[PDB]
Amino acid sequence: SDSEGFKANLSLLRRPGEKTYTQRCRLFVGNLPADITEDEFKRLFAKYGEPGEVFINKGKGFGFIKLESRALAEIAKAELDDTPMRGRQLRVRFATHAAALSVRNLSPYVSNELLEEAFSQFGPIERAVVIVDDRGRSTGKGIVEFASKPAARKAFERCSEGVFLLTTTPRPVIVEPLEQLDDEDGLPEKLAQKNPMYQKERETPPRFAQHGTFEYEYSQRWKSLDEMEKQQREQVEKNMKDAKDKLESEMEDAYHEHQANLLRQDLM
Amino acid sequence: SDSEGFKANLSLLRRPGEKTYTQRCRLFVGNLPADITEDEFKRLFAKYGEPGEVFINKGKGFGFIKLESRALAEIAKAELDDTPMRGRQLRVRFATHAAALSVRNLSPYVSNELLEEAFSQFGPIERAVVIVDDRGRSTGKGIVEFASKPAARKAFERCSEGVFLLTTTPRPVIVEPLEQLDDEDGLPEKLAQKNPMYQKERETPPRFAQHGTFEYEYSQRWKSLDEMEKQQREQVEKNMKDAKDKLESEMEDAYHEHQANLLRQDLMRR
RNA sequence: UUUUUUUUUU
RNA sequence: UUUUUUUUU
């Protein structure tokens, strides 16, 4: 099995200039009994270094706990999800950041730094990242993870009511909520059992479709629909880029055909 | 920075149930000499434990190297990016992942394990994952990091071209390439410099727009086009989901109404 | 052409 | 031959 850690380990597990006990560290353990104590929890993750921001709603059997690093936590979940524990089996996963903001239409020269500079005005930041492609050039979209949920909510309103921008040439930042998901651990078969009918569905083994069946043509149609679904979206995207890609330059006709007209009248 | 104890250390960075020297460990180092040796390259990541498959295109001043954990590479990349080295500053960042597939229209029953159980037939797989929401459930959307590009390629071919399915109730799997991006290290000002005009743009500082113009006005009109782009793509989705959502049932009538058709006809040879 | 800038193998 | 997992301050 996985060694639990060591004091050694703990500083290692700090992903390299990660701030400790980020919200990204907080973990939701659901499913705990009612008479679970404050220190009985905390004991469960004695294993995992000096705990932090810990909390329970005993009435619903659930609670939070921040650990040293996101790596460290992720092991926590690793080691703990589906622990039997007074009959119940604890369910651990990460807590829902919900302070997390996706941002788009960033110039290619927004640096991770500068994004935090900008948005640090709406409060304590936990992290601000500009995303990068396979060659590590900007992809116009970024992440701001906020300290407090007010801080986010205020950055949201402000930036989506008002017009926030970042560099000399003007591109409003478009601040939509980030929706979280896990591609790291995902869904194991472990806990894909304890749903209604794994078997009913999985009773037929992965396979290719018979070049004739109903079940083939059904698919080949559904596919077809989807290929189309794409074609449409792909066209909307193309329509609309073409649409921004035009604008900047016919905008510079509000300042170039509006004076081109008004010039020789006054001092003549 | 630059870590005090290792070896005793590395194993601990490995990940949980990470296959080590996965392609997600593969580092691109670009920007190096004519005259780098192989030896010299590996000696570079001496620090970082047993080196994996490594490779230099001396002809183009770049090479690759796999390290034990994604974890550990991350570090090397960090300790090493921009290292001056006979005239140049080497570039370390993660190499590209050809051999990474996105899958879709995934049964909500499809388990991480099962996913690779299926795909393993096109080649060894490095990992496969069902993505899950905040409430850890299927997003009908997976990932299958493969062995090699051939593997991912035959996997792709055989799934666009054929009709692969995974559970009993027929949902084709939609393999497409999955394109690669870094929500992690991202883009530091560090090297945000070394493009032509950082300043030109950064000259103006992060601000609101002037409730008059002009930058304001161009910006709310850009905002318009956008909310509109949304509306459109929002609809394409609801439209075509309707289309599909229909199909399950409106197909169950090529198989009952073309079949309760052909029973009564021959029932009159009198 | 000092270099950042191209370059991401079967 | 034991229990909140469409419940996340």
Q: Which chain A residues are Cβ-neighbours of B74 within 8 angstroms?
A: 15-16
User: Could you give the count of Cα atoms lying within 13 Å of B16 in the half-sphere of its Cβ?
Assistant: 20
Cα dihedral A193, B124, A72, A23, rounded to 10, equals -70
Per DSSP bridges, beta strands A100-104 and A174-177 are antiparallel
| Same domain assignment for residues B121 and B154 | yes
Distance CA B228, CA A236 (A): 10
Query: Does nucleic acid strand D have an atom less than 7 angstroms from the CB of B258?
Result: no
List CB contacts of B188: < 8 A, sequence separation 6 or more: A111, A112, A113
What is the extent of the structural domain holding B31?
10-94
Reduced to 3 states (helix: H, G, I; strand: E, B; else coil), residue A160 is helix
Cβ neighbours for B156, distance < 8 A, ≥ 6 positions apart: B101, B175, B176, B177
Using CA atoms, how far residue B43 sits from A149, B13, B48, in Å, is 47, 21, 10
CA to C1' distance (Å), from B191 to C3: 14
B85 & B135 share domain: no
Residue A46 near chain B (CB below 8 Å): no
d(CA B100, CA B149): 8
Contacts of A184 (CB under 8 A, 6+ apart): A74, B129
Residues A117 and A164 in one domain: yes
d(CA B72, CA A185): 19
**Residues A178 and A101 sit within 8 Å (Cβ to Cβ):** yes
Asked if the Cβ–Cβ distance from B187 to A110 is below 8 Å, we say: yes
Contact state of A167 with B204 under an 8 Å Cβ cutoff: yes
B131-134's contacts with Cβ under 8 Å and 24+ in sequence apart are B131/A181, B131/A182, B131/A183, B131/A186, B132/A181, B132/A182, B132/A185, B132/A186, B132/A187, B133/A180, B133/A181, B134/A93, B134/A94, B134/A96, B134/A179, B134/A180, B134/A181
SS3 A263: coil
Three-state secondary structure readout of chain B: CCCCCCCCCHHHCCCCCCCCCCCCCCEEEECCCCCCCHHHHHHHCCCCCCCCCEEEEHHHCEEEECCCCHHHHHHHHHHHCCCEECCEECEEEECCCCCEEEECCCCCCCCHHHHHHHHCECECEEEEEEEECCCCCEEEEEEEEECCHHHHHHHHHHHHCCCEECCCCCCCCCCEECCCCECCCCCCHHHHCCCCCHHHHHCCCCEECCCCCCHHHHHHHHHHHHHHHHHHHHHHHHHHHHHHHHHHHHHCCCCCCCCCCCCCCCCCCC
Q: Reduced to 3 states, what is the DSSP secondary structure of residue A232? A: helix
| B57 C-beta less than 7 Å away from strand C | yes
Query: Nearest 5°: phi and psi at A85?
Result: -175, 95
Q: Is B176 on the interface with A (CB under 8 A)?
A: no
Using CB atoms within 10 A of its CB, is residue B25 exposed (0-12), middle (13-18) or buried (19+)? Answer: buried
The answer to whether B257 contacts chain A (CB < 8 Å) is: no
Which DSSP state fits A114? H
B186 and A129 in contact by Cβ < 8 A? yes
- CA–CA distance from A68 to each of A18, A24, B11 (Å)? 10, 10, 19
Q: How far apart are CA A231 and CA B117, in angstroms?
A: 31
For position A63, which CATH number holds? Answer: 3.30.70.330
Instruction: Let me know whether A53 and A126 are in one domain.
Output: no
Closest CA to A64 of A24, A104, A116, A121: A24
Contact call for B195 and A109, based on CB within 8 A: yes
Round and report the angstrom distance from CA (B225) to C1' (C10).
47
Contacts of B237 in chain A (CB under 8 A): 229, 233
Q: What is the CATH number of the domain that holds A104?
A: 6.10.250.1170
Residues 179-238, chain B: which have Cβ within 8 Å of A?
179-190, 192, 195, 197-198, 200-204, 206-209, 214-223, 225-226, 228-229, 232-233, 236-237
Alpha-carbon span A65 to A55, nearest angstrom? 7
Based on the fold, state whether residues A88 and A151 are members of the same structural domain. Answer: no
Enter the DSSP assignment of A2: -
